[PDB]
Amino acid sequence: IPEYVDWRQKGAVTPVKNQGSCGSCWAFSAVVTIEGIIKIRTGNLNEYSEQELLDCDRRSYGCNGGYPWSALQLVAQYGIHYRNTYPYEGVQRYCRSREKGPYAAKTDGVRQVQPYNEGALLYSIANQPVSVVLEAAGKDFQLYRGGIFVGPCGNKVDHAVAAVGYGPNYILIKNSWGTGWGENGYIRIKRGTGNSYGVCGLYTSSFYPVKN
Length: 212
Hints:
It is built from five helices and eight strands; from the N terminus they run E-H-H-H-E-H-E-H-E-E-E-E-E. The protein is α+β, with helices and mostly antiparallel strands. It has one domain: Alpha-Beta Complex (Cathepsin B, Chain A). It starts with a strand and ends with a strand. Belongs to the peptidase C1 family. It catalyses: Hydrolysis of proteins with broad specificity for peptide bonds, but preference for an amino acid bearing a large hydrophobic side chain at the P2 position. Does not accept Val in P1'.
């Protein structure tokens, strides 16, 4: 794999979004990977509906939290609609997929990255955007405003985001707190420190969608 990867430059990342005050970070994370893999396979970049996952994934808790892996399997089992047809509301409602018509896209499956292994995760990112978790509760993360972030932070993950590239000393992460946070909405987290948890527990739980 190359020394640098940035899916943004390859036209596979859509604009940064703001989840607002609704704990839907699991859904936003999932969508970034779906937007990613559809672009890689068909050449076309489209935005997909976070709202649809928020309302339909029965294993998840709507604005109270959820699991990016549950979302991804829903996209594999059923499909997902375009963001335009099923726009983000910032609160859980009821599943309206039925009244939106045919799904815009469908994946074939989900795969998990081997955890606590920097190399395995870099290898996946080199193939496509990946959904990852990290500890975002600490003030340093919340006030992050740029630079390569080294912490401080522990490993009590509580936030799902998406990894969209890397370089010699960092991993590139797209957050869903809008553009006024971090580097226009992104963060560069330090890698290569030799801690198997990863900085802020970044290597704990990573999943990516498969489409043939």
